[PDB]
Design a protein around this motif. Structure first.
Motif, PDB file in Angstrom:
ATOM      1  N   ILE A 275       0.831  -1.200   0.000  1.00  0.00           N
ATOM      2  CA  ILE A 275       0.000   0.000   0.000  1.00  0.00           C
ATOM      3  C   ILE A 275       0.867   1.253   0.000  1.00  0.00           C
ATOM      4  O   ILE A 275       0.689   2.137  -0.845  1.00  0.00           O
ATOM      5  CB  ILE A 275      -0.987  -0.014   1.177  1.00  0.00           C
ATOM      6  N   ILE A 276       1.829   1.349   0.922  1.00  0.00           N
ATOM      7  CA  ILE A 276       2.608   2.587   0.919  1.00  0.00           C
ATOM      8  C   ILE A 276       3.789   2.488  -0.047  1.00  0.00           C
ATOM      9  O   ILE A 276       3.768   3.173  -1.075  1.00  0.00           O
ATOM     10  CB  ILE A 276       3.061   2.998   2.326  1.00  0.00           C
ATOM     11  N   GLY A 277       4.794   1.620   0.223  1.00  0.00           N
ATOM     12  CA  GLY A 277       5.738   1.304  -0.849  1.00  0.00           C
ATOM     13  C   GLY A 277       6.633   2.464  -1.252  1.00  0.00           C
ATOM     14  O   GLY A 277       7.186   3.170  -0.411  1.00  0.00           O
ATOM     15  N   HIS A 278       6.745   2.697  -2.551  1.00  0.00           N
ATOM     16  CA  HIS A 278       7.900   3.404  -3.067  1.00  0.00           C
ATOM     17  C   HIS A 278       7.522   4.572  -3.960  1.00  0.00           C
ATOM     18  O   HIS A 278       6.400   4.685  -4.453  1.00  0.00           O
ATOM     19  CB  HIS A 278       8.795   2.443  -3.836  1.00  0.00           C
ATOM     20  N   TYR A 279       8.514   5.437  -4.152  1.00  0.00           N
ATOM     21  CA  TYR A 279       8.468   6.584  -5.043  1.00  0.00           C
ATOM     22  C   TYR A 279       9.894   7.043  -5.297  1.00  0.00           C
ATOM     23  O   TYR A 279      10.723   7.037  -4.386  1.00  0.00           O
ATOM     24  CB  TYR A 279       7.641   7.730  -4.454  1.00  0.00           C
ATOM     25  N   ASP A 280      10.163   7.439  -6.535  1.00  0.00           N
ATOM     26  CA  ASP A 280      11.411   8.075  -6.920  1.00  0.00           C
ATOM     27  C   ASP A 280      11.072   9.397  -7.589  1.00  0.00           C
ATOM     28  O   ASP A 280       9.990   9.552  -8.152  1.00  0.00           O
ATOM     29  CB  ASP A 280      12.211   7.180  -7.873  1.00  0.00           C
ATOM     30  N   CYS A 281      12.010  10.346  -7.557  1.00  0.00           N
ATOM     31  CA  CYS A 281      11.776  11.658  -8.149  1.00  0.00           C
ATOM     32  C   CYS A 281      11.742  11.651  -9.672  1.00  0.00           C
ATOM     33  O   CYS A 281      11.501  12.708 -10.260  1.00  0.00           O
ATOM     34  CB  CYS A 281      12.849  12.642  -7.694  1.00  0.00           C
ATOM     35  N   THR A 282      11.977  10.517 -10.325  1.00  0.00           N
ATOM     36  CA  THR A 282      11.973  10.423 -11.778  1.00  0.00           C
ATOM     37  C   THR A 282      10.841   9.544 -12.291  1.00  0.00           C
ATOM     38  O   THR A 282      11.032   8.729 -13.192  1.00  0.00           O
ATOM     39  CB  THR A 282      13.306   9.893 -12.277  1.00  0.00           C
ATOM     40  N   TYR A 283       9.650   9.691 -11.726  1.00  0.00           N
ATOM     41  CA  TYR A 283       8.471   9.013 -12.240  1.00  0.00           C
ATOM     42  C   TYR A 283       7.675   9.949 -13.135  1.00  0.00           C
ATOM     43  O   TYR A 283       7.902  11.159 -13.177  1.00  0.00           O
ATOM     44  CB  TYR A 283       7.566   8.511 -11.112  1.00  0.00           C
ATOM     45  N   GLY A 284       6.727   9.366 -13.854  1.00  0.00           N
ATOM     46  CA  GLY A 284       5.767  10.118 -14.637  1.00  0.00           C
ATOM     47  C   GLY A 284       4.433  10.118 -13.918  1.00  0.00           C
ATOM     48  O   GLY A 284       4.128   9.199 -13.155  1.00  0.00           O
ATOM     49  N   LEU A 289      -0.613  10.058  -8.154  1.00  0.00           N
ATOM     50  CA  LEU A 289      -0.332   8.689  -7.763  1.00  0.00           C
ATOM     51  C   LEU A 289      -1.285   8.221  -6.668  1.00  0.00           C
ATOM     52  O   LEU A 289      -1.939   9.015  -5.991  1.00  0.00           O
ATOM     53  CB  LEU A 289       1.111   8.546  -7.296  1.00  0.00           C
ATOM     54  N   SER A 290      -1.361   6.899  -6.512  1.00  0.00           N
ATOM     55  CA  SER A 290      -2.314   6.316  -5.582  1.00  0.00           C
ATOM     56  C   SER A 290      -1.838   6.404  -4.145  1.00  0.00           C
ATOM     57  O   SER A 290      -2.663   6.492  -3.230  1.00  0.00           O
ATOM     58  CB  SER A 290      -2.575   4.856  -5.939  1.00  0.00           C
ATOM     59  N   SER A 291      -0.533   6.357  -3.930  1.00  0.00           N
ATOM     60  CA  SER A 291      -0.002   6.463  -2.581  1.00  0.00           C
ATOM     61  C   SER A 291      -0.175   7.893  -2.089  1.00  0.00           C
ATOM     62  O   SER A 291       0.235   8.831  -2.780  1.00  0.00           O
ATOM     63  CB  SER A 291       1.467   6.069  -2.552  1.00  0.00           C
ATOM     64  N   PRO A 292      -0.801   8.099  -0.926  1.00  0.00           N
ATOM     65  CA  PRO A 292      -1.037   9.471  -0.458  1.00  0.00           C
ATOM     66  C   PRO A 292       0.237  10.185  -0.069  1.00  0.00           C
ATOM     67  O   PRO A 292       0.314  11.415  -0.198  1.00  0.00           O
ATOM     68  CB  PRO A 292      -1.960   9.274   0.750  1.00  0.00           C
ATOM     69  N   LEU A 293       1.240   9.436   0.390  1.00  0.00           N
ATOM     70  CA  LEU A 293       2.545  10.018   0.658  1.00  0.00           C
ATOM     71  C   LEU A 293       3.188  10.525  -0.625  1.00  0.00           C
ATOM     72  O   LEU A 293       3.810  11.592  -0.633  1.00  0.00           O
ATOM     73  CB  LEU A 293       3.429   8.988   1.354  1.00  0.00           C
ATOM     74  N   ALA A 294       3.003   9.799  -1.729  1.00  0.00           N
ATOM     75  CA  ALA A 294       3.484  10.281  -3.019  1.00  0.00           C
ATOM     76  C   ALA A 294       2.710  11.513  -3.473  1.00  0.00           C
ATOM     77  O   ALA A 294       3.295  12.437  -4.052  1.00  0.00           O
ATOM     78  CB  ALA A 294       3.386   9.172  -4.063  1.00  0.00           C
ATOM     79  N   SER A 295       1.403  11.543  -3.194  1.00  0.00           N
ATOM     80  CA  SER A 295       0.576  12.696  -3.534  1.00  0.00           C
ATOM     81  C   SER A 295       1.056  13.952  -2.820  1.00  0.00           C
ATOM     82  O   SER A 295       1.246  15.001  -3.449  1.00  0.00           O
ATOM     83  CB  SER A 295      -0.884  12.413  -3.183  1.00  0.00           C
ATOM     84  N   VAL A 296       1.318  13.845  -1.516  1.00  0.00           N
ATOM     85  CA  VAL A 296       1.775  15.004  -0.755  1.00  0.00           C
ATOM     86  C   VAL A 296       3.201  15.384  -1.148  1.00  0.00           C
ATOM     87  O   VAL A 296       3.518  16.571  -1.305  1.00  0.00           O
ATOM     88  CB  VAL A 296       1.641  14.728   0.752  1.00  0.00           C
ATOM     89  N   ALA A 297       4.064  14.389  -1.366  1.00  0.00           N
ATOM     90  CA  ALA A 297       5.457  14.668  -1.687  1.00  0.00           C
ATOM     91  C   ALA A 297       5.641  15.268  -3.074  1.00  0.00           C
ATOM     92  O   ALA A 297       6.656  15.923  -3.314  1.00  0.00           O
ATOM     93  CB  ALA A 297       6.287  13.394  -1.565  1.00  0.00           C
TER      94      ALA A 297
END
Ligand SMILES: CCCCCCCCCCCCCCCCCC(=O)OC[C@H](COP(=O)(O)OCCN)OC(=O)CCCCCCCCCCCCCCCCC
Ligand SMILES: CCCCCCCCCCCCCCCCCC(=O)OC[C@H](COP(=O)(O)OCCN)OC(=O)CCCCCCCCCCCCCCCCC
Ligand code: HEM
Ligand code: HEM
Ligand code: HEM
Lengths: 444, 48, 57, 100, 140, 285, 378, 108
Positions: A275-284, A289-297
């Motif tokens: 559910i939480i998982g991963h994110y890199d600054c070089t995504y499209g 994104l579905s992860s809310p931490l990715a949404s805020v970041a």
């Protein structure tokens, strides 16, 4: 369609045992490429105080000749059959695998036996490996992620030998000799604890009979004293911070209590970290994104990357989150990370659990793709679980996990536990540890 | 950085923890209960 | 040491349970402490207060 | 239909054709309208901030334009409505995805 | 460096002298991109001590007398590399500024000789800067 | 672009492709430094129009059936430059004290016995090393330069192959003041292999290494997907890997020596980056 | 660089009074912020002098006030400044609220809510001050509004014998209201600072309702001299009111001493609280009356939740403009009906005026708004 | 993200009461700021209750204070709390000035 029927046609792991307690494990599928390797439970956990830096050193000496074929004829013959020979060693296991053609199997297995049980030690070679490993120590100093994971184990497993680094310290490596490695090989690479695992285009009777010819006669006559048996290591829970303000980015890792191997809490925590998982600054697609931490970041440009993840050691481990972020957004990133953990543990909805189950199914199938990672899974599975657990059983354990059991297990393991916090870089804006523990639980 | 181990705080630890061979899970519940017991009694007195 | 484990497991895991716990404790402790301090202040004199001599009058 | 006559009389007597404004210079700005204003071509956006600055000037002096420069209802180049519809549709789609 | 290279001419001429010599004439007038901040006073002391000598100095005076300069340089100075080969090559820059600059340059002559004087005559035969402002340059 | 070019190898390969061709292959996978923020979307629309037509489209499906994919391709996909060789160099003073030098001549296009000869030649001269943390007792160039210079370095062959042309050469990672000795020693070794001094079991080991490399590039479905799609898009027929191995071991070392002669006698090209106070230009090589 | 842009006080003064970006469009209706501020500090100062000459007890309060207005030098003008400054304070307060409601400035949320809390505080403060002179009207006003607080079941009667200071309006009631009237304007000043803080967070408005981000002009020295002009106009109105007709607004019935036996016929507030008293006595129900009053000012709380239009101001919406002027005339009608006795036509049109007040606000604003949203094709 | 760093009042509360960078070696003499502040709010509150029960008239001022001390419920505790809180207020004030002079805080 017919995904259940697609999982029933997944090939089966042939497990058998040679009379030295050897575990042979063939995975026969229909490809022209094979992968043959040795997996050993011998890491940087069983060591003494002065055996630190032994698994790394023996891995670096296992490819430099032997008493049968001197110097570099091993390398010459492996490249003469066009194989890729690789090794690795962590705090818990150690492996040597060979990626080769299917009709070049028995000479590869003969060279593999000569890797394991006949690794002689030469003094020009021990000087050469001492020099090269000091160079690699000084160059792995300049990397950051390995420094953070070494700091995390050191501050999380104080005193207990799990906090021994795989490289070992400088002074337990720059004075090693033949005696330490001799007792290391006499004690650790024993026959009832090693697994020959081979996946690809090869049968089972063929591999079993080759192991009966070559591996039978290895060891199993363990000596009189100091039989290796684990101790349940103590997760202390603390923080270490290496303030070093001459660096561009900051590295923070934070981990909590260990799920283990055999218990299905491992499955529940892999759903939560799917559910939480991963994110890199070089995504499209940043803002959506579905992860809310990715949404805020992405919405407020907090962090460069993170992965919220699992590591499991023998009967222990770390339920973790590593984030890499700039030196002006550490407090806010830490706040939203603990906000997402507690949103899992307090008010978990059904849709996010369904998303986590689907992402974890695709993560498992993608990791079990290609013969070398699947043989890797078979080696680590016949060491840890005692059997490679098939994908029908994985699908049953995934589908029998719903939202209520997820918030039960996550409130068992996240909610109000003592963290291990490792920090490296310009981390003065990192909150003090009592504000972190006060942020672990929110009163509302 | 490989020579960075902690100087251990074995003088400072509570007696439920002090063995470096036992686990640290089952000695957590009573410990958190003790600290939160002190906070609860202080809160009772202040509210009174 | 086992007697605080179930105490943490039943009255300190949540937050609202903790608040209800300290409220019920505050009322019960208020009653018991007022009775105890009244007993102490009667015991510390025993011959001087208006109460016992007025029911003798 | 006479309701168009009501609309024409209302656009006459509403007071925002007096100050040289068109239809979408007077829109109240929440987050959605701020997004739809940010989604504009450059020439329309510069013409928009110019008409807005003339309107604030003319209301500062409380003088209203001559007869030959009032904006007329026949050439009502309302332009901000498609972008604002797209913002509302994407916002409602995101809301429904959160609800289910 | 930013104020200097807002002109295109400087960057074209620096790539020119970088693309025509393998050696000591291929040193820039300006400090490059990466060495900004990583030059230390140790190299400053070294370069001053071994390139400021009492034989490499011309003291010229306009409006002053010779004996005053003789007193100054006689009292207060008292201190005490490799030839450049031709290389041949090209350097291109994709900059997209809608004005192609191009310098085509070959090795001609060292200084001091009538060979160099003949090349000066040749450049005034070919064409120089505009002598007439807003003109047509019908002599070039 | 910053995250991709934090490596040196991307810089050196892109300066290699920007220096060898005067033509369409000089362009980079990444945007240049000045075009950021200065590209309209109409150029994207026109690019999609005159390049995303059905004459150029291969559609590969693994795990899925055929006729579903056929019906979808019917219902949705109904929608409908001779690279010249330049020579020269790109030299870039960077300053990391690790000279990266790529020395490349033009080789051949894809789909030829000459191209398979160049693949055999890169397996003769050495690839990404097999025995990890090993000494490379078989790769000829590393043996020659370790005979020469006693330093940490690396030499690797380099065979880029496209549908019109191709780039063969090698690729050296060396120290600051040791680069010229490594490049000259590797060049002498390639010359004495181009002389004809290449025996039979070395070419047989190279055939086995090329067979191994091709059959190990199709373990995973990622690489198999890319292989099937690129080969179907090249001509229009997937040729199976077994007869690909047949075309691999069909060739002999006469083609290998001819390919090495065609490397050495051609006009060289290079791309170098780092601390370049000792890197020889062309004529010193 | 400069004294002003580095010093910790002068950064506050710089972001308040000098380089605050204010719009270049605001009319005279945006002067009543500064007029309420100047009236508030004038109330504080003149009341402080009155409190230096005042003895709060039910025996000698009226005697001490008479001692101020006769014997102390200029106590009569300072007392008249205090009373008529309360009157002009509520004039400028209702003009401030009328601006903020008409020009769509109720799209601000937190500034509007802190505003309504300031309205509650100023009304309670001015009522306690009106109790303080200890006349007949003050006595019965205190009695009736304290029983209005006793109207609520299960909370009321204990609460009202608690704030009575006894069982009726005794000495303790006069001293309690002296202390709370003598402390509450400082709390009003602090909440005015909080009000102004949220304003300087968001940014001001203009008569068009279009956001004026392009044409901000600095506050000094344009609006400073504009507020000096507004202050001179306010002081001349206040001073002509206190020097020519001081009794034109005040009650005649105050000046009798507090006899708790008489109950005069024409009991009434001071004129600013007539409509609060008119909603009360035009509903024949106790809890219904006090709840309808509290619901009136809570309707002023509700007002941001019914901005269903798509312009901001009411400058460009003529239908809602006419309905707002109906609302203004209806509030002035409530004030007039509250300032009258209670008989049959007054009963009927008081009931009808309260009903039409609630119908204009809670129904007619969104119906006019949805005809606006329909009519311009949105 | 955080209400504590975006709300305009809570920016002030956060920058004065929570996220304030304070030194790490405070001894007990750095309590007297909070002690003077809590004495101040206590004196204001008890004083406001005293000012609710007080009548300033020279005939009956002393009788009003006696009425506070004898007849009003707990008014004696509020009166003595106000007076002794004033004395403790000046105790804490002179401890505060002594800290500020001795540890050299008068370079501000
Ligand atoms: C006794 C009341 C006296 C009111 C006198 C008003 C005189 C001005 C009237 C007027 O001209 O109104 C129209 C005008 C339109 O707005 P604007 O754009 O400024 O004008 C340009 C073209 N006219 O609008 C204006 O000029 C101002 C519009 C009214 C703003 C002030 C509102 C008056 C006070 C309302 C008090 C009640 C508010 C609610 C209180 C509730 C309490 C429970
Ligand atoms: C007073 C009682 C005595 C307190 C005392 O002895 O304090 C000792 C302490 C020593 O200070 P020091 O040795 O510098 O610090 C050691 C820390 N490792 O010294 C201190 O802590 C000194 C700090 C407090 C100093 C002031 C205490 C008295 C307050 C009244 C001072 C009045 C000053 C003048 C005001 C009017 C003018
Ligand atoms: C205690 C009395 C009050 C004082 C001293 C006061 C003071 C001020 C001041 C100084 C301003 C800034 C200047 C201005 O915009 O006019 C202001 C703005 C404002 N006030 Fe108040 N105010 C008070 C009561 C209220 C009330 C009761 C409301 C209504 C709920 C209110 C709503 C507003 C609004 C909406 C603004 C912004 C107006 C604009 O930007 O155009 N105020 N106030
Ligand atoms: C803290 C500041 C204030 C002080 C010290 C103060 C002081 C006083 C005093 C001593 C009186 C009695 C004198 C008299 O009745 O004429 C009084 C009465 C009064 N005050 Fe205040 N006051 C203050 C604030 C206010 C405010 C803000 C208002 C409302 C705008 C107000 C409205 C009144 C009214 C209406 C009276 C009755 C006047 C009369 O009937 O003669 N006061 N105040
Ligand atoms: C604004 C808030 C305050 C109010 C309303 C207030 C009110 C009063 C009143 C009515 C008295 C006379 C009652 C009595 O003495 O028995 C009094 C006495 C006194 N107040 Fe305050 N006071 C306030 C704040 C303070 C403060 C801040 C101090 C200083 C710490 C202070 C120091 C005193 C002292 C020393 C006395 C004399 C007490 C005695 O000897 O009986 N007051 N105050």
């Amino acid at each position: 369609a017919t995904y259940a029927q697609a999982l029933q046609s997944v090939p089966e792991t042939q497990v058998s045992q040679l009379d030295n307690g050897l575990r042979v494990a063939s995975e026969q599928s229909s490809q022209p490429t094979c992968t043959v390797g040795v997996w050993i439970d011998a890491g940087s956990r069983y060591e003494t105080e002065k055996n630190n830096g032994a698994g790394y050193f023996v891995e670096h000496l296992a490819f430099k000749g032997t008493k049968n074929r001197p110097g570099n004829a091993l390398e010459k013959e492996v490249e003469s059959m066009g194989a890729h020979l690789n090794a690795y060693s962590t705090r818990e296991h150690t492996a040597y695998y060979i990626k080769a053609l299917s009709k070049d199997l028995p000479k590869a297995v003969e060279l593999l036996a000569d890797i394991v049980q006949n690794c002689s030690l030469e003094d020009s070679q021990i000087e050469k490996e001492r020099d090269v490993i000091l160079q690699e120590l000084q160059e792995n100093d300049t990397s950051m992620r390995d420094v953070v994971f070494n700091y995390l184990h050191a501050t999380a497993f104080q005193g207990t030998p799990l906090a021994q680094s795989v490289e070992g310290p400088s002074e337990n490596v720059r004075k090693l000799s033949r005696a330490d490695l001799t007792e290391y090989l006499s004690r650790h690479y024993k026959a009832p604890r090693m697994v020959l695992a081979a996946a690809g285009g090869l049968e089972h009777r063929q591999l079993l009979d080759l192991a009966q010819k070559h591996f039978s006669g290895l060891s199993g006559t363990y000596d009189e004293d100091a039989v290796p048996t684990l101790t349940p290591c103590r997760f202390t829970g603390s923080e270490i911070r290496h303030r070093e303000d001459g660096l561009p980015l900051a590295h923070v890792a934070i981990a909590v209590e260990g799920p283990g191997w055999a218990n299905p809490d491992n499955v529940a925590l892999q759903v939560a970290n799917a559910i939480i998982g991963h994110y890199d600054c070089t995504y499209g697609g940043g803002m959506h994104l579905s992860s809310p931490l990715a949404s805020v970041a992405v919405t407020n440009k907090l962090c460069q990357s993170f992965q919220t993840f699992n590591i499991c050691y023998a009967d222990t481990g770390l339920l973790g989150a590593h984030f890499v972020c700039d030196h002006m957004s550490i407090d806010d990133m830490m706040f939203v990370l603990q906000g997402q953990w507690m949103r899992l543990c307090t008010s978990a909805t059904e849709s996010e659990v369904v998303r986590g189950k689907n992402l974890l199914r695709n993560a498992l199938v993608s990791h079990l793709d290609g013969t070398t990672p699947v043989c890797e899974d078979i080696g680590r599975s016949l060491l840890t679980y005692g059997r490679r657990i098939p994908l029908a059983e994985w699908e049953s354990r995934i589908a029998e996990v719903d939202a209520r059991v997820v918030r039960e297990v996550c409130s068992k393991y996240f909610y109000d536990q003592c963290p291990a916090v490792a920090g490296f870089g310009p981390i003065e804006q990192l909150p003090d540890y009592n504000r972190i523990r006060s942020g672990m639980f929110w009163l509302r | 950085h490989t020579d960075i181990k902690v100087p251990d705080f074995s003088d400072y630890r509570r007696p439920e923890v002090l063995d470096s061979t036992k686990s640290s899970k089952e000695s957590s519940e009573a410990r958190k209960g003790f600290s939160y017991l002190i906070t609860a009694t202080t809160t009772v007195g202040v509210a009174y | 040491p086992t007697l605080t484990a179930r105490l943490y497991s039943l009255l300190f895991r949540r937050t609202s349970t903790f608040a209800l716990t300290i409220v019920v404790g505050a009322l019960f402790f208020e009653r018991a402490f007022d009775q105890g301090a009244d007993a102490i202040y009667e015991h510390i004199n025993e011959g001087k207060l208006w109460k016992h001599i007025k029911h003798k009058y | 239909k006479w309701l168009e006559g009501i609309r024409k009389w209302y656009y006459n007597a509403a007071g925002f054709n007096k100050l040289g404004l068109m239809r979408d210079d007077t829109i109240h700005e929440n987050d959605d309208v701020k997004e739809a204003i940010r989604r504009l071509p450059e020439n329309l956006y510069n013409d928009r901030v110019f008409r807005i600055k003339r309107a604030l000037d003319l209301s500062m002096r409380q003088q209203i334009l001559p007869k030959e420069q009032w904006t007329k209802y026949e050439e009502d180049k309302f332009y901000l409505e498609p972008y604002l519809k797209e913002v509302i549709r994407e916002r409602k789609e995101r809301e429904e995805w959160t609800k289910k | 460096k930013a104020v200097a290279f807002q002109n295109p001419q400087a960057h074209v001429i620096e790539n020119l002298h970088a693309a025509a010599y393998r050696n000591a004439l291929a040193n820039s007038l300006y400090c490059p991109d990466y060495r900004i901040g990583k030059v230390t006073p140790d190299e400053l002391h070294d370069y001053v001590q071994n390139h400021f000598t009492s034989a490499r100095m011309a003291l010229i005076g306009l409006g002053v007398s010779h004996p005053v300069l003789k007193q100054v340089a006689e009292q207060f100075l008292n201190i005490r590399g490799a030839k450049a080969k031709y290389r041949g090559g090209e350097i291109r820059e994709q900059n997209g500024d809608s004005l192609v600059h191009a310098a085509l340059v070959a090795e001609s002559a060292a200084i001091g000789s009538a060979e160099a004087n003949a090349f000066s005559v040749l450049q005034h035969v070919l064409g120089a800067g505009p002598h007439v402002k807003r003109g047509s340059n019908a002599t070039s | 672009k910053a995250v991709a070019f934090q490596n040196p190898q991307a810089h050196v390969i892109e300066n290699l492709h920007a220096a060898a061709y005067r033509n369409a292959l000089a362009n980079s996978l990444y945007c240049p430094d000045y075009r950021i923020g200065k590209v309209t979307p109409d150029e994207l629309h026109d690019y999609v129009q005159n390049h995303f037509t059905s004459a150029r489209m291969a559609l590969i499906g693994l795990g899925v059936s055929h006729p579903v994919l056929k019906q979808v391709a019917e219902q949705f996909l109904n929608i409908r430059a001779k690279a010249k060789y330049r020579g020269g160099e790109i030299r870039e003073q960077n300053g990391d004290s690790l000279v990266h030098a790529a020395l490349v001549a033009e080789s051949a296009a894809i789909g030829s016995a000459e191209a398979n000869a160049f693949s055999v030649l890169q397996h003769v001269l050495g690839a990404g090393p097999h025995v990890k943390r090993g000494s490379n007792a078989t790769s000829s160039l590393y043996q020659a330069v370790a005979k020469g210079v006693h330093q940490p370095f690396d030499v690797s062959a380099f065979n880029a192959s496209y549908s019109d042309s191709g780039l063969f050469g090698f690729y050296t990672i060396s120290q600051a003041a040791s680069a010229g000795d490594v490049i000259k020693a590797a060049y002498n070794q390639v010359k004495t292999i181009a002389q004809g001094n290449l025996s039979n079991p070395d070419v047989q080991a190279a055939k086995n290494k090329l067979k191994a490399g091709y059959l190990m590039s199709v373990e995973s479905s990622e690489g198999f997907l890319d292989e099937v799609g690129c080969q179907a898009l090249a001509a229009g027929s997937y040729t199976p890997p077994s007869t690909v191995l047949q075309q691999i071991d069909a060739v002999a070392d006469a083609d290998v020596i001819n390919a090495a002669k065609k490397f050495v006698s051609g006009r060289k090209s290079m791309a170098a980056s780092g601390n370049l106070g000792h890197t020889p230009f062309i004529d010193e090589l | 660089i400069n004294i002003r842009k580095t010093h910790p006080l002068m950064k506050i003064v710089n972001n308040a009074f000098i380089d605050l970006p204010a719009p270049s469009n605001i009319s005279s209706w945006w002067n009543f912020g500064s007029l309420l501020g100047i009236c508030l500090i004038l109330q504080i100062l003149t009341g402080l002098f009155l409190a230096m000459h005042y003895t709060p007890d039910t025996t000698t309060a009226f005697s001490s006030v008479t001692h101020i207005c006769r014997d102390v030098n200029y106590g009569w003008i300072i007392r008249y400044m205090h009373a008529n400054g309360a009157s002009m304070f509520f004039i400028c307060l209702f003009m401030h609220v009328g601006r903020g409601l008409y020009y769509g400035s109720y799209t601000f949320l937190e500034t509007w809510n802190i505003g309504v809390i300031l309205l509650f505080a100023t009304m309670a403060t001015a009522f306690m001050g009106y109790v303080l002179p200890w006349g007949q009207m003050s006595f019965w006003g205190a009695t009736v509004i304290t029983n209005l607080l006793s109207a609520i079941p299960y909370i009321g009667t204990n609460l009202v014998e608690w704030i009575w200071g006894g069982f009726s309006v005794d000495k303790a009631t006069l001293t309690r209201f002296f202390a709370f009237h003598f402390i509450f304007p400082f709390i009003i000043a602090a909440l005015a600072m909080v009000h102004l803080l949220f304003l300087h967070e968001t940014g001001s408005n203009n008569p068009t309702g279009i956001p004026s981000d392009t044409d901000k002009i600095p506050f000094h020295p344009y609006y400073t001299i504009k507020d000096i002009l507004g202050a001179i106009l306010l002081i001349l109105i206040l001073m002509l009111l206190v020097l020519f007709t001081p009794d034109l607004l005040g009650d005649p019935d105050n000046y009798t001493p507090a006899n708790p036996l008489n109950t005069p016929p024409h009991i009434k507030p001071e004129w600013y609280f007539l409509f609060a008293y008119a909603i009360l006595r035009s509903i024949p129900n106790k809890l219904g009356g006090v709840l309808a009053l509290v619901l009136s000012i809570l309707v002023l709380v509700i007002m941001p939740l019914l901005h269903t239009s798509k312009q901001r101001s009411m400058m460009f919406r003529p239908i809602s403009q006419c309905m707002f002027w109906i609302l203004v005339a209806d509030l002035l009608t409530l004030t007039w009906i509250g300032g009258q006795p209670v008989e049959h036509p007054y009963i009927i049109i008081g009931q009808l005026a309260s009903i039409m007040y609630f119908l204009i606000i809670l129904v007619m604003m969104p119906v006019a708004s949805i005809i606006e949203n329909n009519l311009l094709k949105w």
